[PDB]
Amino acid sequence: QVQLVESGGGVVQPGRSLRLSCEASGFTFSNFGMHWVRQTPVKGLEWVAIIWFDGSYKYYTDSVKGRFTISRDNSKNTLYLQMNSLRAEDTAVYYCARARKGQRSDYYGSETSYTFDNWGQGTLVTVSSASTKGPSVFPLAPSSKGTAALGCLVKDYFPEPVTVSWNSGALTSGVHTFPAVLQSSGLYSLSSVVTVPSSSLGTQTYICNVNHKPSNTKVDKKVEPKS
Amino acid sequence: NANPNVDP
Amino acid sequence: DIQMTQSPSTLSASVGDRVTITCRASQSINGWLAWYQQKPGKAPKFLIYKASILESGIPSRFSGSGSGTEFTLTISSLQPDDFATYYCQQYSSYWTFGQGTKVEIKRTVAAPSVFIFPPSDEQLKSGTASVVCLLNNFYPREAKVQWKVDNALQSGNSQESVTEQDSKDSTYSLSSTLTLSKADYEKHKVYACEVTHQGLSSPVTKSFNRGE
């Protein structure tokens, strides 16, 4: 099967460099031109660069000219993206893709144009000056004023991800663990909440289990009504 | 957008 | 250079429905328009090219039409596997994409249940106070959240996060977190989050007084 697998992503300081790799399988790599494309949640999809099947021609999107270089090693079935002088706005998931004729295969003539398909799974590039940091865990205490809500605020960690469970996984119903947000400090924060019977505040303990593997941080936070 | 593959 | 605009940004539909998504180009792209489908955490998948040609292996319920600057993608009878985000792409001059249309699961309007959480005493030692407002199990996802501190509207110091649509009841939950300095928190008394949502006949305000 046609498969592209990107690698090399990670955290890189602004102004530093990073080389992405894309390994191809299931087809003759050297018969196809290749693309890099990137995606962010807010700005969406953006084409980055294209290279001919034999490396004999290539070109780039304006925002990366003079800083990114696309290349290939056909002996290794590998596509590269060398990224120099990285900027915060280069943070994105980077995909490689195979050039595709955007017209019927049987048509031969001037009315043809090319695009790309068979994208890989992607590799995340995070340009940041932040260092690895474990989270602080704070209680979202159930109100003294049916159904009650409580939770844990998991604040100021880097990089993603953190995992949150409740009562060592025994409590799963009604749990909402929110997607992390990037704060102005450059660190991530999220909350995990659960709705419980207001009667269960008297009959049950609620502990949020937080694991941040990049910092080898494990925290159990008991969440109770404030006194 | 020109053909960047070996074959048309 | 060629800008692509999709409408709507989010579309709600039911299994079996006919769905149409619009894509508009800033100038003529001939028929060099492609469509992609993307699932969360996955790569976009090639669906249609030349505005109307279905890629091999794509189910026949997908169709595309259009010319010049106006294009449409249509799903004749929506199936559970079709809830996803769809992107158009012009490939007439370089390659540019629309911002995507998310197809979500339709259900009845559901009002949010609102909860407010004061900062913990432990957090205040960090120098920052986080106030969290929770909107639980509501539909549709669009909602208005307003923060007031001693009746002063707060702007720029809050961040929102929203869950994906729940698998069981197709609702959303949303958090809004207000960030204050310890000193600012201790100088004010009334903290209030006001939620406006069409499931509520009037806005719901949840509030607390610091130290009470």
Residue numbers in the entry:
A (entry chain H): 1 to 52, 52A, 53 to 82, 82A, 82B, 82C, 83 to 100, 100A, ...
B (entry chain P): 1 to 8
C (entry chain L): 1 to 94, 96 to 213
Which of the paper's sentences describe this entry?
IGHV3-33-encoded antibodies are prevalent in the human humoral response against the Plasmodium falciparum circumsporozoite protein (PfCSP). As the most abundant surface protein expressed by Pf sporozoites and with essential roles in parasite development and invasion, Pf circumsporozoite protein (PfCSP) is a major target for biomedical interventions. PfCSP is composed of three domains: an N-terminal domain that undergoes proteolytic cleavage prior to hepatocyte invasion; a polymorphic, T cell epitope-containing C-terminal domain; and a conserved central region largely composed of consecutive major NANP repeat motifs.
Comparison of the 1210- and MGG4-like binding modes revealed that the N-core conformation was largely dictated by the HCDR3. In particular, we demonstrate that the MGG4-like conformation induced by Ky15.11 was enabled by a small Ser in position HCDR3(-6). Although the structural basis of this phenomenon remains unclear, our structure of Ky15.11 in complex with NDN reveals that MGG4-like binding is possible with the NPNV motif in the C-core rather than DPNA. To this end, we first examined the buried surface area (BSA) of each crystallized Fab-peptide complex for the 10 high-affinity mAbs, focusing only on the “core” epitope that consists of the full N-core and the first three residues of the C-core.
